[PDB]
Coordinates of C-alpha atoms (C1' of nucleotides) and ligand atoms in Angstrom, one line a residue:
Chain A
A9 CA 133.2 78.5 107.0
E10 CA 135.6 80.9 105.3
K11 CA 132.9 82.3 102.9
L12 CA 131.4 84.5 105.7
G13 CA 134.9 85.7 106.6
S14 CA 136.0 87.0 103.2
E15 CA 132.5 88.6 102.6
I16 CA 133.1 90.6 105.8
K17 CA 136.7 91.5 104.7
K18 CA 135.5 92.3 101.1
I19 CA 132.9 94.7 102.4
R20 CA 135.2 96.2 105.1
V21 CA 137.8 97.0 102.4
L22 CA 135.1 98.3 100.1
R23 CA 134.1 100.7 102.9
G24 CA 137.7 101.8 103.5
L25 CA 137.7 100.7 107.2
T26 CA 140.5 98.8 108.8
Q27 CA 140.1 95.9 111.3
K28 CA 140.7 98.3 114.2
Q29 CA 138.1 100.8 112.9
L30 CA 135.5 98.0 112.4
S31 CA 136.2 96.5 115.8
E32 CA 135.4 99.7 117.7
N33 CA 132.9 99.4 120.5
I34 CA 132.1 95.9 119.2
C35 CA 135.1 93.6 119.9
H36 CA 138.9 93.4 119.7
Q37 CA 140.6 93.9 116.4
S38 CA 142.1 90.4 116.6
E39 CA 138.6 88.9 116.7
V40 CA 137.8 90.7 113.5
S41 CA 141.0 89.2 112.0
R42 CA 139.9 85.7 113.2
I43 CA 136.3 86.3 111.8
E44 CA 137.7 87.2 108.4
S45 CA 140.0 84.2 108.2
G46 CA 137.2 81.8 108.8
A47 CA 138.6 80.5 112.1
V48 CA 135.5 81.5 114.0
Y49 CA 131.8 82.1 113.8
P50 CA 130.9 85.4 115.5
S51 CA 128.2 85.7 118.2
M52 CA 124.9 87.6 117.6
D53 CA 126.2 90.7 119.4
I54 CA 129.4 91.0 117.3
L55 CA 127.6 90.1 114.0
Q56 CA 124.8 92.6 114.6
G57 CA 127.5 95.2 115.3
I58 CA 129.6 94.4 112.2
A59 CA 126.4 94.4 110.0
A60 CA 125.3 97.7 111.3
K61 CA 128.6 99.5 110.9
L62 CA 129.0 98.1 107.4
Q63 CA 125.4 98.8 106.5
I64 CA 124.5 95.3 105.5
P65 CA 121.2 93.5 106.1
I66 CA 122.0 90.8 108.6
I67 CA 120.4 88.1 106.4
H68 CA 123.2 88.6 104.0
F69 CA 125.8 87.0 106.2
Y70 CA 123.5 84.1 106.7
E71 CA 122.9 83.7 103.0
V72 CA 126.6 83.4 102.1
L73 CA 127.2 81.2 105.2
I74 CA 127.0 77.8 103.5
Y75 CA 126.5 77.8 99.7
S76 CA 128.4 79.6 96.9
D77 CA 127.5 82.1 94.2
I78 CA 124.7 83.7 96.2
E79 CA 124.6 87.1 94.3
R80 CA 124.2 85.4 91.0
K81 CA 121.6 82.9 92.3
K82 CA 119.5 85.8 93.7
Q83 CA 119.5 87.7 90.3
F84 CA 118.6 84.4 88.6
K85 CA 115.7 83.9 91.0
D86 CA 114.4 87.5 90.3
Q87 CA 114.7 86.9 86.6
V88 CA 112.7 83.7 86.6
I89 CA 110.1 85.5 88.8
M90 CA 109.8 88.4 86.4
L91 CA 109.5 86.0 83.4
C92 CA 106.8 83.9 85.3
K93 CA 104.9 87.2 85.9
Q94 CA 105.1 87.8 82.1
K95 CA 104.0 84.2 81.3
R96 CA 107.2 83.6 79.4
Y97 CA 107.2 79.9 80.1
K98 CA 109.3 78.7 77.1
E99 CA 112.2 80.9 78.3
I100 CA 111.7 79.9 81.9
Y101 CA 111.8 76.3 80.8
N102 CA 115.1 76.8 78.9
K103 CA 116.7 79.1 81.4
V104 CA 116.0 76.9 84.4
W105 CA 116.8 73.6 82.6
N106 CA 120.3 75.0 81.8
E107 CA 120.9 75.9 85.5
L108 CA 119.5 72.5 86.6
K109 CA 122.0 70.5 84.5
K110 CA 124.9 72.1 86.4
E111 CA 123.9 69.7 89.1
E112 CA 125.1 72.0 91.9
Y113 CA 124.2 71.1 95.5
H114 CA 122.0 73.7 97.2
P115 CA 118.7 72.2 98.2
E116 CA 116.6 75.4 98.5
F117 CA 117.8 76.8 95.2
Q118 CA 117.4 73.4 93.5
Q119 CA 113.9 73.2 94.9
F120 CA 113.1 76.6 93.4
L121 CA 114.5 75.5 90.0
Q122 CA 112.5 72.3 90.0
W123 CA 109.3 74.0 91.1
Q124 CA 109.6 76.6 88.3
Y125 CA 110.6 73.9 85.8
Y126 CA 107.6 71.7 86.4
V127 CA 105.2 74.6 86.3
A128 CA 106.8 75.6 83.0
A129 CA 106.6 72.1 81.7
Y130 CA 103.0 71.8 82.6
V131 CA 102.0 75.1 81.1
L132 CA 103.8 74.1 78.0
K133 CA 101.8 70.9 77.9
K134 CA 105.0 68.8 78.0
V135 CA 103.7 67.0 81.0
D136 CA 100.1 66.3 82.2
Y137 CA 98.5 68.1 85.2
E138 CA 98.5 65.0 87.3
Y139 CA 102.2 64.3 87.0
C140 CA 103.0 68.0 87.7
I141 CA 101.0 67.9 90.9
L142 CA 102.7 64.7 92.1
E143 CA 106.2 66.1 91.4
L144 CA 105.2 69.3 93.2
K145 CA 103.9 67.4 96.2
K146 CA 107.3 65.6 96.4
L147 CA 109.1 68.9 96.7
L148 CA 106.8 69.6 99.7
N149 CA 107.5 66.2 101.2
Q150 CA 111.2 67.3 101.2
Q151 CA 110.1 69.4 104.3
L152 CA 112.8 71.8 103.2
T153 CA 113.7 74.5 105.7
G154 CA 115.6 77.3 103.9
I155 CA 116.1 81.1 103.9
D156 CA 112.9 82.0 102.0
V157 CA 110.2 80.9 104.5
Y158 CA 107.4 81.2 101.8
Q159 CA 108.7 78.8 99.2
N160 CA 106.5 75.8 100.2
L161 CA 103.5 78.1 100.2
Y162 CA 104.4 79.2 96.7
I163 CA 104.5 75.5 95.7
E164 CA 101.1 74.9 97.3
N165 CA 99.7 77.8 95.3
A166 CA 100.9 76.2 92.1
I167 CA 99.3 72.9 93.1
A168 CA 96.0 74.7 94.0
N169 CA 96.0 76.5 90.6
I170 CA 96.5 73.2 88.7
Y171 CA 93.7 71.4 90.6
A172 CA 91.5 74.4 89.9
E173 CA 92.0 74.7 86.2
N174 CA 91.6 71.0 85.6
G175 CA 88.1 70.7 87.1
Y176 CA 89.0 69.9 90.7
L177 CA 87.5 73.1 92.1
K178 CA 86.7 71.7 95.5
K179 CA 90.2 70.5 96.0
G180 CA 91.7 73.8 94.7
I181 CA 89.4 76.0 96.8
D182 CA 90.2 74.0 99.9
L183 CA 94.0 74.3 99.2
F184 CA 93.7 78.1 98.7
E185 CA 91.9 78.4 102.1
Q186 CA 94.7 76.4 103.7
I187 CA 97.3 78.7 102.3
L188 CA 95.6 81.9 103.5
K189 CA 95.4 80.3 106.9
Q190 CA 99.1 79.3 107.0
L191 CA 99.7 83.0 106.0
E192 CA 97.9 84.3 109.0
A193 CA 100.6 82.6 111.1
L194 CA 103.6 83.8 109.1
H195 CA 105.1 87.2 109.0
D196 CA 103.6 89.6 106.4
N197 CA 104.0 88.7 102.8
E198 CA 101.1 90.8 101.5
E199 CA 101.9 90.6 97.8
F200 CA 101.6 86.8 98.0
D201 CA 98.3 87.1 100.0
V202 CA 97.0 89.2 97.1
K203 CA 98.1 86.6 94.6
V204 CA 96.5 83.7 96.5
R205 CA 93.2 85.7 96.9
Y206 CA 93.2 86.3 93.1
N207 CA 93.7 82.6 92.2
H208 CA 91.1 81.7 94.9
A209 CA 88.7 84.3 93.4
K210 CA 89.2 82.7 89.9
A211 CA 88.4 79.2 91.3
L212 CA 85.3 80.5 93.2
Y213 CA 84.1 82.1 90.0
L214 CA 84.6 78.9 88.0
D215 CA 82.5 77.2 90.8
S216 CA 79.7 79.8 90.2
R217 CA 80.2 81.3 93.6
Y218 CA 80.1 84.9 92.3
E219 CA 79.5 86.7 95.5
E220 CA 82.4 85.0 97.3
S221 CA 84.6 85.6 94.3
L222 CA 83.9 89.3 94.4
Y223 CA 84.5 89.2 98.1
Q224 CA 88.0 87.9 97.6
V225 CA 88.6 90.2 94.7
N226 CA 87.6 93.4 96.6
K227 CA 89.6 92.2 99.6
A228 CA 92.7 91.8 97.4
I229 CA 92.2 95.2 95.6
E230 CA 92.0 96.8 99.1
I231 CA 95.3 95.1 100.1
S232 CA 96.9 96.1 96.8
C233 CA 96.0 99.8 97.2
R234 CA 97.1 99.9 100.9
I235 CA 100.6 98.5 100.0
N236 CA 100.8 100.4 96.7
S237 CA 101.2 97.2 94.6
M238 CA 100.3 97.1 90.9
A239 CA 101.4 93.5 90.4
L240 CA 97.9 91.9 90.2
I241 CA 95.7 95.1 90.3
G242 CA 94.8 95.0 86.6
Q243 CA 93.8 91.3 86.8
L244 CA 91.8 92.1 89.9
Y245 CA 89.7 94.8 88.3
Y246 CA 89.1 92.5 85.4
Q247 CA 88.0 89.7 87.7
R248 CA 85.8 92.2 89.5
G249 CA 84.2 93.2 86.2
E250 CA 83.6 89.5 85.6
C251 CA 81.9 89.1 89.0
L252 CA 79.9 92.3 88.6
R253 CA 78.5 91.0 85.3
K254 CA 77.3 87.7 86.7
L255 CA 75.8 89.4 89.7
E256 CA 73.8 91.7 87.4
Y257 CA 75.2 95.1 88.6
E258 CA 74.5 98.2 86.7
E259 CA 76.3 98.4 83.3
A260 CA 78.2 101.5 84.4
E261 CA 79.8 99.8 87.4
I262 CA 80.7 96.8 85.2
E263 CA 82.3 99.1 82.6
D264 CA 84.2 100.9 85.3
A265 CA 86.0 97.8 86.5
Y266 CA 87.0 96.8 82.9
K267 CA 88.3 100.3 82.2
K268 CA 90.5 100.2 85.3
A269 CA 91.9 96.9 84.1
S270 CA 92.5 98.2 80.6
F271 CA 94.3 101.2 82.1
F272 CA 96.8 98.9 84.0
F273 CA 97.2 96.5 81.1
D274 CA 98.2 99.4 79.0
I275 CA 100.7 101.2 81.2
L276 CA 102.2 97.9 82.5
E277 CA 102.5 96.7 78.8
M278 CA 100.6 93.4 79.6
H279 CA 100.0 92.6 75.9
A280 CA 98.7 89.0 76.4
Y281 CA 96.0 90.1 78.9
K282 CA 94.7 92.8 76.5
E283 CA 92.9 90.1 74.4
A284 CA 90.5 89.1 77.2
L285 CA 89.2 92.6 77.0
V286 CA 87.4 92.2 73.7
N287 CA 83.8 93.3 73.7
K288 CA 83.7 94.9 77.2
Chain B
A30 CA 88.0 82.7 81.4
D31 CA 90.7 84.2 79.3
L32 CA 93.1 85.3 82.1
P33 CA 95.6 82.7 83.3
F34 CA 96.1 81.6 86.9
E35 CA 99.1 83.4 88.6
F36 CA 101.9 81.0 89.5
Chain C
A8 CA 119.4 87.0 126.7
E9 CA 116.0 86.4 128.3
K10 CA 114.1 88.1 125.5
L11 CA 115.4 86.0 122.6
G12 CA 114.9 82.9 124.7
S13 CA 111.3 83.4 125.6
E14 CA 110.6 84.5 122.1
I15 CA 111.9 81.3 120.6
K16 CA 110.0 79.3 123.3
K17 CA 106.8 81.2 122.5
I18 CA 107.0 80.6 118.8
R19 CA 108.0 76.9 119.4
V20 CA 105.0 76.3 121.6
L21 CA 102.8 78.2 119.0
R22 CA 104.1 75.6 116.5
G23 CA 103.4 72.7 118.9
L24 CA 106.9 71.5 118.8
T25 CA 108.9 70.3 121.8
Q26 CA 112.6 71.1 122.5
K27 CA 113.6 67.7 121.3
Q28 CA 111.6 68.1 118.1
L29 CA 113.0 71.6 117.5
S30 CA 116.5 70.3 118.2
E31 CA 116.5 67.5 115.7
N32 CA 119.4 67.7 113.1
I33 CA 120.3 71.1 114.6
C34 CA 121.6 70.6 118.2
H35 CA 121.0 68.8 121.5
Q36 CA 117.6 69.3 123.2
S37 CA 119.5 70.7 126.3
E38 CA 120.9 73.6 124.2
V39 CA 117.4 74.5 123.0
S40 CA 116.6 74.6 126.8
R41 CA 119.5 76.8 127.6
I42 CA 118.8 79.1 124.6
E43 CA 115.2 79.5 125.8
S44 CA 116.2 80.3 129.4
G45 CA 118.5 82.9 128.0
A46 CA 121.7 81.3 129.5
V47 CA 123.4 81.4 126.1
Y48 CA 123.4 83.2 122.7
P49 CA 123.1 80.6 119.9
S50 CA 125.6 80.3 117.1
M51 CA 124.8 81.2 113.5
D52 CA 124.4 77.5 112.5
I53 CA 122.0 76.8 115.4
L54 CA 120.1 80.1 115.1
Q55 CA 119.7 79.5 111.4
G56 CA 118.3 76.1 111.8
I57 CA 116.0 77.2 114.6
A58 CA 114.7 80.1 112.4
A59 CA 114.2 77.8 109.4
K60 CA 112.2 75.1 111.3
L61 CA 110.1 77.8 113.0
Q62 CA 109.7 79.7 109.7
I63 CA 110.8 83.1 111.1
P64 CA 112.9 85.6 109.2
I65 CA 116.1 85.5 111.1
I66 CA 116.2 89.3 111.4
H67 CA 113.3 88.9 113.9
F68 CA 115.6 87.2 116.4
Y69 CA 118.1 90.1 116.2
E70 CA 115.3 92.7 116.5
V71 CA 114.1 91.3 119.8
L72 CA 117.7 90.9 121.0
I73 CA 118.1 94.0 123.0
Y74 CA 115.0 96.3 123.2
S75 CA 111.4 95.6 124.3
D76 CA 108.0 96.0 122.7
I77 CA 109.4 95.3 119.2
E78 CA 106.1 94.3 117.5
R79 CA 104.2 97.4 118.8
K80 CA 107.1 99.6 117.7
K81 CA 107.0 98.2 114.1
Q82 CA 103.3 98.8 113.8
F83 CA 103.9 102.3 115.1
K84 CA 106.6 102.9 112.5
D85 CA 104.2 101.6 109.7
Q86 CA 101.4 103.8 110.9
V87 CA 103.6 106.9 111.0
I88 CA 104.9 106.0 107.5
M89 CA 101.4 105.7 106.0
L90 CA 100.3 109.0 107.6
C91 CA 103.4 110.7 106.2
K92 CA 102.4 109.3 102.8
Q93 CA 99.0 110.9 103.3
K94 CA 100.5 114.2 104.4
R95 CA 98.6 113.9 107.7
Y96 CA 101.3 115.9 109.6
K97 CA 99.0 117.2 112.4
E98 CA 98.3 113.5 113.4
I99 CA 101.9 112.6 113.0
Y100 CA 102.9 115.5 115.2
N101 CA 100.5 114.4 118.0
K102 CA 101.1 110.6 117.7
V103 CA 104.9 110.8 117.6
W104 CA 104.9 113.4 120.4
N105 CA 103.0 111.1 122.8
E106 CA 105.4 108.3 122.1
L107 CA 108.4 110.6 122.6
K108 CA 107.3 111.7 126.0
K109 CA 107.6 108.2 127.4
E110 CA 111.4 108.7 127.3
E111 CA 112.1 105.0 126.7
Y112 CA 115.7 104.2 125.7
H113 CA 116.0 102.7 122.2
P114 CA 118.4 104.9 120.1
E115 CA 117.2 103.8 116.6
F116 CA 113.5 104.1 117.4
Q117 CA 114.2 107.4 119.2
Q118 CA 115.9 108.7 116.1
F119 CA 113.0 107.7 113.9
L120 CA 110.6 109.5 116.3
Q121 CA 112.6 112.7 116.4
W122 CA 113.1 112.6 112.6
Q123 CA 109.4 112.4 112.0
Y124 CA 108.5 114.9 114.8
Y125 CA 110.8 117.6 113.3
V126 CA 109.6 117.1 109.8
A127 CA 106.0 117.4 111.0
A128 CA 106.9 120.5 113.1
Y129 CA 108.5 122.0 110.1
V130 CA 105.5 121.3 107.8
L131 CA 103.0 122.7 110.3
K132 CA 105.2 125.8 110.5
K133 CA 105.8 125.4 114.2
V134 CA 109.5 125.7 113.5
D135 CA 111.6 127.4 110.8
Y136 CA 113.3 125.5 108.0
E137 CA 116.8 126.3 109.3
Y138 CA 116.2 125.0 112.8
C139 CA 114.6 121.8 111.4
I140 CA 117.7 121.2 109.1
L141 CA 120.0 121.7 112.0
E142 CA 118.1 119.2 114.2
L143 CA 118.1 116.7 111.4
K144 CA 121.8 117.1 110.9
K145 CA 122.3 116.4 114.6
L146 CA 120.5 113.0 114.2
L147 CA 122.9 112.3 111.4
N148 CA 125.8 113.3 113.6
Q149 CA 124.7 110.5 116.0
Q150 CA 126.4 108.1 113.5
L151 CA 123.7 105.8 114.6
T152 CA 124.0 102.2 113.4
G153 CA 120.7 100.2 113.8
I154 CA 118.6 97.6 112.1
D155 CA 117.1 99.9 109.4
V156 CA 120.1 100.4 107.2
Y157 CA 118.4 103.3 105.3
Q158 CA 117.3 105.6 108.1
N159 CA 120.2 108.1 107.8
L160 CA 119.5 108.4 104.0
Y161 CA 115.8 109.0 104.8
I162 CA 116.9 111.9 107.0
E163 CA 119.2 113.1 104.3
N164 CA 116.2 113.1 101.9
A165 CA 114.3 115.2 104.3
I166 CA 117.1 117.7 104.6
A167 CA 117.4 117.9 100.8
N168 CA 113.6 118.5 100.4
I169 CA 113.8 121.4 102.9
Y170 CA 116.9 123.0 101.2
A171 CA 115.0 122.6 97.8
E172 CA 111.7 124.2 98.8
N173 CA 113.4 127.1 100.6
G174 CA 115.4 128.4 97.6
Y175 CA 118.6 126.3 98.1
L176 CA 118.3 124.4 94.9
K177 CA 122.0 123.9 94.5
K178 CA 122.5 122.5 98.0
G179 CA 119.3 120.4 97.5
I180 CA 120.2 119.0 94.1
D181 CA 123.8 118.2 95.3
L182 CA 122.5 116.3 98.4
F183 CA 120.0 114.4 96.2
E184 CA 122.9 113.3 94.0
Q185 CA 124.9 112.2 97.1
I186 CA 121.9 110.1 98.2
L187 CA 121.4 108.3 94.9
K188 CA 125.1 107.6 94.9
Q189 CA 125.0 106.1 98.4
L190 CA 122.1 103.9 97.3
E191 CA 124.0 102.2 94.5
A192 CA 126.5 101.1 97.2
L193 CA 123.8 99.7 99.5
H194 CA 121.5 96.7 98.9
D195 CA 118.4 97.4 96.9
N196 CA 115.7 99.7 98.1
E197 CA 114.1 100.6 94.9
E198 CA 111.0 102.3 96.4
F199 CA 113.3 104.7 98.2
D200 CA 115.3 105.2 95.0
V201 CA 112.0 106.2 93.3
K202 CA 111.2 108.7 95.9
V203 CA 114.6 110.4 95.8
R204 CA 114.5 110.7 92.0
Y205 CA 111.1 112.3 92.4
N206 CA 112.2 114.9 94.9
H207 CA 115.3 115.5 92.7
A208 CA 113.1 115.9 89.6
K209 CA 111.1 118.5 91.5
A210 CA 114.2 120.4 92.5
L211 CA 115.6 120.2 88.9
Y212 CA 112.3 121.6 87.6
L213 CA 112.4 124.5 90.1
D214 CA 115.9 125.2 88.8
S215 CA 114.5 125.3 85.3
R216 CA 116.5 122.2 84.3
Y217 CA 113.5 120.7 82.5
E218 CA 115.3 118.1 80.5
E219 CA 117.1 116.7 83.5
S220 CA 113.9 116.7 85.5
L221 CA 112.1 114.7 82.8
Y222 CA 115.1 112.3 82.7
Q223 CA 114.7 111.6 86.4
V224 CA 110.9 111.3 86.2
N225 CA 111.1 108.8 83.3
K226 CA 113.8 106.8 85.1
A227 CA 111.6 106.8 88.3
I228 CA 108.5 105.8 86.3
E229 CA 110.5 102.9 84.7
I230 CA 111.7 101.6 88.1
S231 CA 108.1 102.0 89.4
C232 CA 106.6 99.8 86.6
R233 CA 109.4 97.3 87.0
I234 CA 108.9 96.8 90.7
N235 CA 105.1 97.2 90.5
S236 CA 104.9 100.1 92.8
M237 CA 102.1 102.7 92.8
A238 CA 103.5 104.7 95.7
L239 CA 104.8 107.6 93.7
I240 CA 103.6 106.9 90.2
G241 CA 100.7 109.4 90.0
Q242 CA 102.9 112.2 91.2
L243 CA 105.5 111.1 88.7
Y244 CA 103.0 111.3 85.8
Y245 CA 101.9 114.7 87.0
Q246 CA 105.5 115.8 87.1
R247 CA 106.1 114.3 83.7
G248 CA 103.2 116.4 82.4
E249 CA 104.8 119.5 84.0
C250 CA 108.1 118.9 82.2
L251 CA 106.4 118.0 78.9
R252 CA 104.7 121.4 79.0
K253 CA 107.9 123.4 79.6
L254 CA 109.7 121.5 76.9
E255 CA 106.8 122.4 74.5
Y256 CA 105.7 118.8 73.5
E257 CA 102.5 118.2 71.6
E258 CA 99.4 118.9 73.6
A259 CA 98.3 115.2 73.4
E260 CA 101.5 113.9 74.9
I261 CA 101.1 116.5 77.7
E262 CA 97.4 115.6 78.3
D263 CA 98.3 111.9 78.4
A264 CA 100.6 112.3 81.4
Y265 CA 98.0 114.4 83.3
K266 CA 95.2 111.9 82.6
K267 CA 97.4 109.1 83.9
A268 CA 98.1 111.1 87.1
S269 CA 94.4 111.7 87.5
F270 CA 93.8 108.0 87.2
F271 CA 96.1 107.1 90.1
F272 CA 94.9 110.0 92.3
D273 CA 91.3 108.7 91.9
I274 CA 91.9 105.0 92.7
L275 CA 94.4 105.7 95.5
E276 CA 92.0 108.4 96.9
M277 CA 94.7 111.1 97.0
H278 CA 92.2 113.9 97.5
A279 CA 94.8 116.6 98.3
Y280 CA 96.7 116.0 95.0
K281 CA 93.5 116.3 92.9
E282 CA 93.5 120.0 93.5
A283 CA 96.7 120.5 91.5
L284 CA 95.0 118.9 88.4
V285 CA 92.7 121.9 87.7
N286 CA 92.9 123.2 84.2
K287 CA 94.7 120.3 82.4
Chain D
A13 CA 104.2 123.7 92.0
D14 CA 101.2 122.4 93.9
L15 CA 102.4 118.9 94.8
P16 CA 104.5 118.6 98.0
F17 CA 108.0 117.1 98.4
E18 CA 107.8 113.5 99.6
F19 CA 109.4 113.0 103.0
Chain E
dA4 C1' 109.3 67.0 128.6
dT5 C1' 112.8 70.1 130.6
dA6 C1' 116.7 71.3 133.1
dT7 C1' 121.5 71.1 135.2
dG8 C1' 126.5 69.5 136.4
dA9 C1' 130.6 68.6 134.3
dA10 C1' 133.3 67.7 130.3
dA11 C1' 134.3 68.8 125.9
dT12 C1' 134.4 72.5 122.1
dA13 C1' 134.4 77.0 120.6
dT14 C1' 134.9 82.1 121.2
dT15 C1' 137.1 86.2 122.4
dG16 C1' 140.5 89.5 124.7
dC17 C1' 145.2 90.7 125.6
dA18 C1' 150.0 90.6 124.8
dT19 C1' 153.1 90.4 121.4
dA20 C1' 155.3 89.6 116.8
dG21 C1' 156.0 90.1 111.7
Chain F
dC2 C1' 147.9 97.1 109.9
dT3 C1' 147.1 92.0 110.7
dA4 C1' 147.9 87.6 112.8
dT5 C1' 148.7 84.2 116.4
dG6 C1' 149.8 82.0 121.3
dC7 C1' 147.6 81.6 125.3
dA8 C1' 144.5 82.7 128.9
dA9 C1' 140.0 83.9 129.9
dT10 C1' 135.0 83.4 128.7
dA11 C1' 131.3 81.2 126.4
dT12 C1' 128.8 77.5 124.1
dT13 C1' 127.4 72.9 123.5
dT14 C1' 127.0 67.8 124.5
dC15 C1' 126.3 63.9 127.2
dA16 C1' 124.7 61.9 131.2
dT17 C1' 121.5 62.2 134.5
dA18 C1' 117.5 64.1 137.6
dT19 C1' 113.0 66.0 138.6
Ligands
CA302 CA1 136.3 77.0 114.6
CA303 CA1 126.1 83.6 129.0

DNA sequence: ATATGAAATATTGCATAG
DNA sequence: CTATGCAATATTTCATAT
């Protein structure tokens, strides 16, 4: 693997250090030479040292270890993610399709493209909910490992959303509960937790379980405030207003929730979402 | 049910 | 070493895998054995595979590599961080002090402790600004490496704040600019970037550079919205209101910023900050 | 200048 | 299912050379 | 400053054993 090597050399030159300087208290300068030429994989001790001195998150050296064009792929991923957030499914569909037809080998990145492409296809009504789900399940059946440990959970969340908005509330709700459970086990990804609770809350609400919906909503609002996340907080206040209405709370409490939602939709420029707020 | 599910 | 080993074994057992199962497509079962007994450090390929199948961020295995009690330490850091956010310096001073007096050896965690203890000592007026700055500079002079790539910059931000609020605007402003420059070189830490620009905007304002202050505020607010962070956004709106007033904008523009700040202070329960909003 | 610097 | 000796591979340090 | 032979260390596999 010569890709790791030149990434280390590139960043060392960029930092103005020589091999001798870099090797200090870590290893011999000749081992740095051999690491940069690709002739050797470094041990944990040595890598940890090099990453520290160069001020590079260690996962970076693993990322560039096998597949190419890692910086561009990461910006691509963040772009798609932003667009998905904005519900710009047409663009996602085109953007991801273009990338997909390069036919490059990189299972985890290819899986990400396919996941996003299918969801986009489904939202655009180019494919039916049942076919989307089956394709998504097939990505799962890949049992793909990968750098991003949460990718399968993200695919399960899409699957659960699609069951839920096509009448299969029980199946959707049970899948949401499984995701929250699998999350208990994994390291903290609290933004995702908030997102799953939100979708789950929507499904509970569609199933007329108003109290449980509000439970999930308030839990997710609490998590959002504690981590200072605005990603879903507008939607959550809106949802909580919905629950408050069905549960027959006082009009003021109901109005409060919707005002808080309208606040976030405004400042975050969520134009689409602003419609739902008619007559409340 | 105007707000979409979040993918 | 023994720590990595038993940590891999613990997580494997937790996942109900056997050494053979874990080893499939990665390495021989006997190497998993020798890795768990701490006889060997595993190579990047093998570690990478093991982390993927076990769904652990690979940094986790490096964190546990050398020093003990890593989970407790990380929760401690998170608590200190939240308290700092809340300006609960008394509690920070006590909490950190108890931890420091254990005299455990762990340079990076040591440094984090001292950094927070001095800042708290400084804010509680137990020590003068000049002594605090000197002690912080001594931590920098450690040239400490470590897992948290940003810690030195965090300490720099503290030093700059202290210069700024003790009349040394020029030295403060200049150190803020160095920090922002060092960030563009490092991997993204956009929340930190927002905090630095905020502190900088405060210094600029104290130096009567109202237009540059507003520039930093608006830049920081734009980053805040893009990354969906609320951490500093109320303060930013307040500060935007401050500059708008000095630059003699229309009263409605000014009142807008202040209302927006009042909104975030309410929902984030920033009671302290609400004081500053009297008469506007 | 009532708001504090953010440490 | 795990663990260990012994052989086979892979790394790193030290001397030295361009 | 970097790179490479070669010796010294370290890891991994394969064959077994408990
Ligand atoms: Ca090799
Ligand atoms: Ca060893």
